[PDB]
C-alpha cells in the first residue's frame, strides 16, 4: 500500500536544493497568488423555554434552527466560574504541560516537523453517503475520504479514541501512514479557518491557547488505484475547486450565506466533509489530554501502563457527552449541516464513569487507613482507631489531600447546567482521588497504594517512614518464630488446635487467633492482651476490601449501585454471622472463666467472631488466605445469600437474584413482566402474568391482581432457582 499525490502544476516544487529546512516540497511563486485570491474572494465571512429563544433575538436567520455564539451554550453562557478558574479549568482547554507551539513554515511544508497520521472512523455507519463531496481534476473523479492530521510531535504512546454519538460506540482511528506531499501550512490554515470557523460555526475550540495551532488538518480526496495504493489530490486543487464552486444535483449540499451554513435536503462542500470534521475535536482533545497525562505520571509517582485505566479513573460523571469542544456547537452543526440520509416520510452508559474505581478505592483507602492505624497503635482501642479512621477518610480531607496531586488540573470536570459552586469541584476531586487510588490498587500492587496514600498523607518525609513501615503485632513481637512452643503448656490453644484442623489452617502465632475469640467480657491475660474489638474493626475493613475487589472484577458490567447492593447482600450482619455459626465458632469463643454454662451467643457477636477471625487470619498470614476463605465461605454462595435472605419484595428479590447471572457486555437489565391472560367478569378477574428476564421466561404466576399475579410469577421464578 503506497500513497501518492497529484502532479504539481508549477505550484509546488520537489527540488532538492530549493528546500528550506527539513522540508521536502516547496511552494513556488504561483501559490501566493492563488492564496491571495482565495483569501480575498473567500473572506466575506468577517465582513458582515421562551426566554431562551427570546435571548437569541438580535440577528436571526431562519426557523427557530440553532445558531452558535462564541462562549455561550444553548441556554446562557457555558461558563460561570472565575478569573483564575481559566488556567485551572480543563473545559477552558487548558492542559498542563502545553506551551507555545513554534511556528513551522510560512508556505513550504514541514516533513521534519510534522508527523502525519490518517484519521478514519470505524464502523462507517454515518460516513458513506449517496452524495459525497467529489471534485474532478484530470478527467478523474476524486472522492472524499476522511482527514489527514499533522502533529507537531510523535504520539508514541496513545490509546484508541472511542466516542459515542449516534447511539453507536465509534472508534476514531489515527493510523500513521505515509505523508501526502504537495501541501502548505498557510493553505491548511486557510481551509481550516474557512471550514472550522466560517462554514461550521465551531468557536471555543482552542487549538492554540490564549502562532501555529496544535494539529494541522488536510482534506483527503482519493481516486483509488489498481495493483497499488491510491492517489491523494493536492491542496492547490482543493483551493481551486472550493473557489470555483463557491460561485437533484443540488441535493445534499452545504450552502452558506452571511446562522452560518445549512444542508440543502430539498461552496462545493456537501454533507460529507462536515460530518467528518465533527469528530476531529474529540480526537484532538483525546490526544492533548493523553499528552498532558505524562505530567500526571510524575505527580502520582506511578506510571500507568494502561492510559485507558487512568483516563477512566479521571473521567467524571458530569460528562453527558464524550465530545471535545462545546456540546452546543457540536449538536447544532450536526443538525444544521451534518449528514442526513433520505427518509421515506418526506439509555446512557453509567459504566464509563469512575464510580467503579471509586467504589473500589473506598475499600482501598478504608483498608490502608485501618491497617496502618491498627499496627502503629497497638495500645489504642477501637474508639481511637475509628476516630482517626473517620477523621482521615473524610471527603473534605480526601479532597485537600487530592489537591497535592493537582487532580483538579487533570480531572474531566464539565460545566453544569447553571449551578456550579466550589462544593461540586472539591467533592469531584475527593471522589476522583478514590478512583485513582483504586486504579493504582488494581494495576499496580497493593504496596503501590500503600506508598501512594502514605506519601500523600504526611508532608514531613520523616513521618512517612513510620506510617509505611508499621511494626509487627505485639503478640508476634514477643515470639520471633512462632507460638508452637507455647502450645505444650497452653490452656486454650488445645481447644483451638481442633479449630485449626477443621479448617486446615496451621496458625503461626496462635495468640492472634486466641485474641480473635476473646469476647468483650474478659480484660487482659497472658495468652492474650485485650479483646478482639480491634480485630472486629480491622476485620470489617479487610472483609469489605476483598468483597469489593471480588465484585469489581467478576462483575465488570454492573454499575456502582448494583455492586453496592450485591455487596450489601454478600457481606452483612446475618450473612457473616450465618457463616460463623456454620463453621462452629461458638464453642471456641472465650468469655468469663467458668460462668458461661451454655453456648448461647448473639447474632452480632457471631458476626464479630467471623470478622475477628478474618482479621487474625490476615495478620498471621496475608490477603490471599482471606480471599480464599471468602471464596469458599461467601462469594459462590452469593445467590444463596439472596434466596434465604429477608423478604421484602418478590420483584426486588428476583431482580437481585437475576443480577448474579452471567452478564456479557451490555448492562444488566431488570425483570420484565408481560401479562398473558386477562379473564373473568367485571367483578372478579384472574390475571396470568409471566416474567421475562432478557428474553427467556422465568416462572409464571396467576393472581387476582396484576401486582399479585406478577409477584406470584416472581415467586415462581425464585422457586426455580432452588
Amino acid at each position: 500500500v503506497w500513497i501518492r499525490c497529484t502532479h504539481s502544476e508549477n505550484y509546488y516544487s520537489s527540488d532538492p536544493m530549493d528546500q528550506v529546512g527539513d522540508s521536502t516540497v516547496v511552494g513556488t511563486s504561483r501559490l501566493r497568488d492563488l492564496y491571495d485570491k482565495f483569501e480575498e474572494e473567500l473572506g466575506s465571512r468577517q465582513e458582515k423555554x421562551x426566554x431562551x429563544x427570546x435571548x437569541x433575538x438580535x440577528x436571526x436567520x431562519x426557523x427557530x434552527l440553532w445558531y452558535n455564539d462564541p462562549g455561550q451554550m444553548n441556554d446562557g453562557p457555558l461558563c460561570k466560574c472565575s478569573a483564575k478558574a481559566r488556567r485551572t479549568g480543563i473545559r477552558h482547554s487548558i492542559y498542563p504541560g502545553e506551551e507555545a507551539i513554534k511556528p513551522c513554515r510560512p508556505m513550504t511544508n514541514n516533513a521534519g516537523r510534522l508527523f502525519h497520521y490518517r484519521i478514519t472512523v470505524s464502523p462507517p455507519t454515518n460516513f458513506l453517503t449517496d452524495r459525497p463531496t467529489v471534485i474532478e481534476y484530470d478527467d478523474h473523479e476524486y472522492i472524499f475520504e476522511g482527514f489527514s492530521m499533522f502533529a507537531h510531535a510523535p504520539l508514541t504512546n496513545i490509546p484508541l479514541c472511542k466516542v459515542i454519538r449516534f447511539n453507536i460506540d465509534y472508534t476514531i482511528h489515527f493510523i500513521e501512514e505515509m505523508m501526502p506531499e504537495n501541501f502548505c501550512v498557510k493553505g491548511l490554515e486557510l481551509f481550516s479557518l474557512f471550514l472550522f470557523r466560517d462554514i461550521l460555526e465551531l468557536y471555543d475550540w482552542n487549538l492554540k491557547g490564549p502562532c501555529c495551532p496544535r494539529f494541522h488538518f488536510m482534506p483527503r480526496f482519493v481516486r483509488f488505484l489498481p495493483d497499488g495504493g491510491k492517489e491523494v489530490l493536492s491542496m492547490h486543487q482543493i483551493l481551486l475547486y472550493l473557489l470555483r464552486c463557491s460561485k437533484x444535483x443540488x441535493x445534499x449540499x452545504x450552502x452558506x450565506x452571511x446562522x452560518x451554513x445549512x444542508x440543502x435536503x430539498x461552496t462545493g462542500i456537501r454533507s460529507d466533509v462536515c460530518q467528518h470534521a465533527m469528530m476531529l475535536p474529540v480526537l484532538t482533545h483525546h490526544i492533548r489530554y493523553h499528552q498532558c497525562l505524562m505530567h500526571l505520571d510524575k505527580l502520582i509517582g506511578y506510571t500507568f501502563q494502561d492510559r485507558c485505566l487512568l483516563q477512566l479513573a479521571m473521567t467524571h460523571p458530569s460528562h453527558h457527552l464524550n465530545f471535545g469542544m462545546n456540546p452546543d456547537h457540536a449538536r447544532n452543526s450536526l443538525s444544521n449541516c451534518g449528514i442526513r440520509q433520505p427518509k421515506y416520510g418526506d439509555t446512557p452508559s453509567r459504566i464509563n464513569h469512575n464510580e467503579r474505581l471509586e467504589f473500589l478505592g473506598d475499600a482501598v483507602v478504608e483498608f490502608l487507613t485501618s491497617v496502618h492505624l491498627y499496627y502503629l497503635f497497638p495500645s489504642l482501642e477501637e474508639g481511637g482507631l475509628a476516630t482517626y479512621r473517620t477523621a482521615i477518610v473524610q471527603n473534605q480531607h480526601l479532597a485537600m489531600l487530592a489537591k497535592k496531586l493537582e487532580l483538579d488540573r487533570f480531572m474531566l470536570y464539565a460545566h453544569g447546567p447553571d449551578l456550579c459552586r466550589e462544593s461540586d469541584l472539591r467533592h469531584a476531586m475527593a471522589n476522583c482521588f478514590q478512583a485513582l487510588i483504586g486504579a493504582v490498587y488494581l494495576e499496580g500492587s497493593l504496596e503501590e497504594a500503600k506508598q501512594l496514600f502514605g506519601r500523600l498523607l504526611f508532608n514531613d518525609p520523616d513521618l512517612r517512614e513510620v506510617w509505611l513501615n508499621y511494626p509487627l503485632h505485639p503478640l508476634q513481637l514477643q515470639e520471633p518464630n512462632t507460638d508452637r512452643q507455647l502450645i505444650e503448656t497452653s490452656p486454650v490453644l488445645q481447644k483451638l488446635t481442633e479449630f485449626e484442623e477443621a479448617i486446615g489452617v496451621i496458625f503461626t502465632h496462635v495468640r492472634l487467633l486466641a485474641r480473635a475469640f476473646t469476647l468483650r467480657t474478659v480484660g487482659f491475660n497472658h495468652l492474650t492482651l485485650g479483646h478482639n474489638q480491634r480485630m472486629e474493626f480491622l476485620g470489617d475493613s479487610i472483609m469489605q476490601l476483598v468483597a469489593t475487589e471480588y465484585l469489581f472484577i467478576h462483575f465488570p458490567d454492573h454499575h456502582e449501585g448494583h455492586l453496592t447492593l450485591l455487596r450489601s447482600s454478600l457481606v452483612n450482619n446475618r450473612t457473616q454471622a450465618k457463616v460463623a455459626e456454620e463453621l462452629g465458632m461458638q464453642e471456641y469463643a472465650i468469655t468469663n472463666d467458668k460462668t458461661k454454662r451454655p453456648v448461647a451467643l448473639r447474632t452480632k457477636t457471631l458476626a464479630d467472631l467471623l470478622q475477628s477471625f478474618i482479621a487474625a487470619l490476615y495478620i498471621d498470614k496475608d490477603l490471599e488466605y482471606v480471599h480464599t476463605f471468602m471464596n469458599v465461605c461467601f462469594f459462590p454462595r452469593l445467590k444463596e445469600f439472596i434466596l434465604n435472605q429477608d423478604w421484602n419484595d418478590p420483584k426486588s428479590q428476583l431482580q437481585q437474584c437475576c443480577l448474579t447471572l452471567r452478564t456479557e457486555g451490555k448492562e444488566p437489565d431488570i425483570p420484565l413482566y408481560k401479562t398473558l391472560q386477562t379473564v373473568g367478569p367485571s367483578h372478579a378477574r384472574t390475571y396470568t402474568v409471566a416474567v421475562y428476564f432478557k428474553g427467556e421466561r422465568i416462572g409464571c404466576g396467576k393472581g387476582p391482581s396484576i401486582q399479585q399475579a406478577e409477584m406470584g410469577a416472581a415467586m415462581d421464578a425464585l422457586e426455580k432457582y432452588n
Binding site: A502, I503, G504, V505, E582, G584, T628, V632, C633
Partner: peptide, 23 residues
C-alpha cells in the same frame, strides 16, 4: 452447622498452604 462447607474450606486451605510450600 454444615460439615460440607468446612470440608471444602479445609480442602482449599490445605491446597493453598501446600501451594506455598512448593515455593
Amino acid at each position: 452447622a454444615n460439615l460440607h462447607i468446612l470440608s471444602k474450606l479445609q480442602e482449599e486451605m490445605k491446597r493453598l498452604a501446600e501451594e506455598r510450600e512448593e515455593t
